[PDB]
Amino acid sequence: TCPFYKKIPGTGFTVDAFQYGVVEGCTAYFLTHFHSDHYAGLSKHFTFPVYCSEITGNLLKNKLHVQEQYIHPLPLDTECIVNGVKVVLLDANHCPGAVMILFYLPNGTVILHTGDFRADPSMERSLLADQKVHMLYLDTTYCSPEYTFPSQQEVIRFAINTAFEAVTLNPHALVVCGTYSIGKEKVFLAIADVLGSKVGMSQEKYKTLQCLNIPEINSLITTDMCSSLVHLLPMMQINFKGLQSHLKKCGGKYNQILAFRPTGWTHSNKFTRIADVIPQTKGNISIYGIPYSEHSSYLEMKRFVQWLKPQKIIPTVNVGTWKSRSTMEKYFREWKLEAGY
Ligand code: NI
């Protein structure tokens, strides 16, 4: 059944709860972002109101074929009424179109649901600074102090310089970037841009990127692989076998591949800086794992929660085992005591 942590008390609202059949009493289904764990169950046959950002709305229409009448896009940073309840959507700093949702309850409670987020100090000067938040429904993906990672800016810097050097040493070297969902477009766009190429991809992925209101996008991407030296591939196909495979297809136009696997956290974060990264090599093919996260580090999450001073925190991630639940509850208490709320 739909779990309590997907239900908004005092409303008929649910968040990211599309795979339980009909949910009894739900009058509006909110969708935080277009990632399959969150949208799972949506299709052309859904006939209930979906509320989401304009970008997520494009993806529901064009990729899932949900019928326009059931898609209710809302502007960000704007007080809106939904079945008689004041709500605001805010940028979640996750993937394109991803939002947090502020619910203002008739009883006077204020609830923030973060969807998936990477906390940032910039959020401390959004509409959140304006009033008190009583309940936080929190993206707890990396809620443990071993989870450090560098800034997005540091990670893009590294990838830019790595690829530029490699291609300038060898003009017949091809760059490949893995993907399996939206998000992390900056990796392949910033590399494409330093190399004066467009990025080349399948027609399915091109369609996906054309929904995202990215400015000047027609100048940045293409479906003509031949014209491009930055290729996007399914993340599955980023390994030496599927790379060699792919290298055959380019027909002697390239003799080397330099490939990137944008990972979340991996255990070399606990010993190795971004400056000191190395790839896995097999001949003319190299693979860099780079830790580009679109989720909060443990410290970023800690700071956001200590700024917000919520009265109750309900985790939405890693809730499936008693050990995780108990560990999280400990950090929540530490934070509270350190900060005096
Ligand atoms: Ni996500």
Side-chain angles (χ1 to χ4, degrees), residues 77-197:
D77 303 320
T78 302
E79 299 190 319
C80 294
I81 310 303
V82 176
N83 303 345
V85 173
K86 174 160 85 169
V87 309
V88 172
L89 310 193
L90 310 168
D91 207 279
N93 186 39
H94 184 52
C95 67
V99 295
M100 322 194 277
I101 317 155
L102 259 185
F103 298 95
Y104 296 77
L105 262 50
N107 74 5
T109 304
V110 178
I111 301 170
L112 176 61
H113 194 305
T114 65
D116 276 359
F117 87 140
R118 183 162 189 180
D120 196 80
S122 65
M123 295 168 179
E124 300 166 26
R125 307 164 276 274
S126 67
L127 291 187
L128 287 173
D130 298 39
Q131 86 295 282
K132 159 174 205 62
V133 166
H134 301 81
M135 308 192 87
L136 184 61
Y137 286 72
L138 181 62
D139 175 18
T140 43
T141 304
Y142 298 121
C143 193
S144 206
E146 66 270 32
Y147 299 108
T148 49
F149 28 74
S151 67
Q152 284 170 175
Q153 189 288 329
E154 290 177 78
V155 178
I156 292 303
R157 181 83 301 201
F158 175 84
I160 286 179
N161 297 358
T162 298
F164 176 82
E165 162 175 315
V167 176
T168 304
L169 296 165
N170 177 202
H172 311 274
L174 175 64
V175 177
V176 170
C177 294
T179 186
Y180 45 31
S181 63
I182 64 172
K184 314 201 208 185
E185 292 82 8
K186 193 63 163 160
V187 179
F188 58 82
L189 299 180
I191 290 174
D193 187 70
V194 76
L195 301 173
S197 190

Side-chain angles (χ1 to χ4, degrees), residues 33-36 38 94-95 116 294-295:
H33 64 286
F34 200 78
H35 277 168
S36 67
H38 301 261
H94 184 52
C95 67
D116 276 359
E294 289 179 342
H295 296 281

